[PDB]
């Protein structure tokens, strides 16, 4: 039938952006670079600011540390595809617009305890999808195509995103435990 669910507070869930799947590993690298750099330079810095403005500077520092590692993921792929020209898709542009909306309301976002909770839950959502679904599938196709260096790179990114997921889960557990 019709099956309606409330959208998340402040639309914070729409910060998650999903790399697009293609037949060709060059194109999956391009899509991954695009999302990795978006997370490095837009999504995670915004989450870090939400955390700091919420009075949670340790969680802010974790998002800053994750942001740097997303940029490492992008730079590993860029090294392997030195000539690729990466442009932001409509969906990335729309995410960056949403980022700027949140930044303009950052005090209201942070003063409600949902701001940081939903930022950590969206970070967990992307780290989960990337580590368990997207990047394993990119690794598998690269290997099928005989591109061992790129398959090995995606395998390393899988392990790194898995670590991020674990950092985010521990942070969420600590945010939610008062004492
Ligand atoms: Fe990522
Ligand atoms: Fe990444
Ligand atoms: Fe990550």
Curated annotation (Swiss-Prot):
Keyword Metal-binding attached: yes
Keywords, ordered alphabetically: Cyanelle, Iron, Metal-binding, Plastid
Needed cofactors: Fe(3+)
Residues that, per the record, bind Fe(3+) 2: 70, 127, 161, 164
GO MF annotation list: ferric iron binding; oxidoreductase activity
Keyword set includes Metal-binding: yes
Record InterPro entries: Ferritin-like (IPR012347), Ferritin-like_diiron (IPR009040), Ferritin-like_SF (IPR009078), Rbr2/Nigerythrin (IPR052753), Rr_diiron-bd_dom (IPR003251)
A GO cellular component entry from the record: cyanelle
Subcellular location: Plastid, Cyanelle
3-(L-phenylalan-2'-yl)-L-valine (Phe-Val), cross-linked positions: 16-126
UniProt function note: Exhibits oxidase-like and peroxidase-like activities in vitro.
Note: The name 'symerythrin' reflects the protein's high level of internal symmetry.
The protein's assembly and partners: Monomer.
Record's protein name: Symerythrin
Source species of the chain: Cyanophora paradoxa
